[PDB]
Design a protein around this ligand. Structure first.
Ligand SMILES: N[C@@H](CCC(=O)O)C(=O)O
Ligand SMILES: N[C@@H](CCC(=O)O)C(=O)O
Ligand SMILES: [Cl-]
Ligand code: NA
Ligand code: NA
Ligand code: NA
Ligand code: NA
Lengths: 251, 254
């Protein structure tokens, strides 16, 4: 049968290009937690697949003036991919336009910053401007702030929007480099913060989780794969395989 | 007017309780708790009315391996005796094959409730011994996790629990807690409930970490159009901070 087109995005340790001396081709180019997930789903559900990086390099958000989506979400809306297998947050706004499996990992927004300071919460960032802060452009964290009616978060959005050419970044990698190289705190998902802090010992999580969400496999709205992938994820969780995969990649 | 939805649930503090009062209470007004607040919010978002009914057999739901039949809230949904189950109903592999669930409103895992002051640190330490008995709620998700597991520690635990089932499998969390308090017994329990119980009984503690990871969701019959609508409403309530407020209200030490 037809191979499924799987959209994804580079994001350590979920999706990476493998290091090698010989050039690599096709699906053999990729590794990571989400790549191992995809391999397991493919075996359980009996499909073949072709991995393609999302061409615009975005997770996906809606344009406020023209209403169009971008990123992996737009690829699914337009039926240019069958699945999105990535650290793709299940959110209110996205679930209205695409379908998601139940989550394979749970997480929340938190803060990445340097050690040694009195900053302990988002509220502490919101009430000042000397320490700048920001988020990945056109992802779920940005959209959370953009939509929030909560005073603290609304104040933070006004700051990030004002300063967006500087403080909104195109990747978590760029956000980390800003924390390391300037007085900047990065609003980041907690799973990714756990990976970064285990490797950058001068960095830490500030405060707790601001919210709660899961990562799910995206599908176009109405896809029959959505419920089949949910059941496969639940099987992998119960057998311990997801925990083993997390340990492997967060080591 | 549209037909009221029948909502099956089960008593379990602090998710669903009977309100304390002097005058008798009637109908939906009898109930309070996190899940009751959740139901009220869903009803307003989606625009339905409802009638709360306690599951007749008092069970969450498991399948009989001899006759293949389900019981509990799961069976009430399969049979269309209820439109929704709004309860601390775990989303599990075996259940998602027969009923539908919303995406989770809370995440949790199985862990161990025991008395303080012990060298027992994990499920492995319990599994290797038989002086301290252990068990779970009959016909719920924790029992079914053990019954199905291929992992050596957990399969060994299941063999023990199955052998001693008439004594160590209980009908409710409340009964399990009483057994921990009155005998040398450790109870396999969901972590959100452990947190509630240990906040209020300072002689008790969680032992070890989470054995697994799962969510609670609203159950519906398979194919129900309410499933996706309730998912969207849950996501809205989470993002607005209302689920967090509800958890703080119902879990609000030792
Ligand atoms: N995982 C996010 C991107 C990173 C972020 O927004 O922090 C998403 O699905 O949009
Ligand atoms: N919440 C469980 C019942 C309690 C338990 O199994 O620990 C269920 O949905 O079956
Ligand atoms: Cl779902
Ligand atoms: Na959807
Ligand atoms: Na009960
Ligand atoms: Na009374
Ligand atoms: Na289902």
């Amino acid at each position: 049968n037809r191979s499924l087109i799987v959209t994804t995005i580079l994001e350590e340790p979920y999706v990476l290009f493998k290091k090698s001396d010989k050039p690599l081709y096709g699906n053999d180019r990729f590794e990571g937690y989400c790549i191992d997930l995809l391999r397991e789903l493919s075996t359980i559900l009996g499909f073949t697949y072709e991995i393609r990086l999302v061409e615009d390099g975005k997770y996906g958000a809606q344009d406020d003036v023209n209403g169009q989506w971008n990123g992996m979400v737009r690829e699914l809306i337009d039926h240019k991919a069958d699945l999105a297998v990535a650290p793709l947050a299940i959110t209110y706004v996205r679930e209205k336009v695409i379908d998601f499996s139940k989550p394979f990992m749970t997480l929340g927004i938190s803060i990445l910053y340097r050690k040694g300071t009195p900053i302990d919460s988002a509220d502490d960032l919101a009430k000042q401007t000397k320490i700048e802060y920001g988020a990945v452009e056109d992802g779920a964290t940005m959209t959370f702030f953009k939509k929030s009616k909560i005073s603290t978060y609304d104040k933070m959005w006004a700051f990030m929007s004002s300063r967006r050419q500087s403080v909104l970044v195109k990747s978590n990698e760029e956000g980390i480099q800003r924390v390391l190289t300037s007085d900047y705190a990065f609003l980041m998902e907690s799973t990714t913060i756990e990976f970064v802090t285990q490797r950058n010992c001068n960095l830490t999580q500030i405060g707790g989780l601001i919210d709660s969400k899961g990562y799910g496999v995206g599908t176009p709205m109405g896809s029959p794969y959505r419920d089949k992938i949910t059941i496969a994820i639940l099987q992998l969780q119960e057998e311990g395989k997801l925990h083993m995969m997390k340990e492997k990649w967060w080591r």
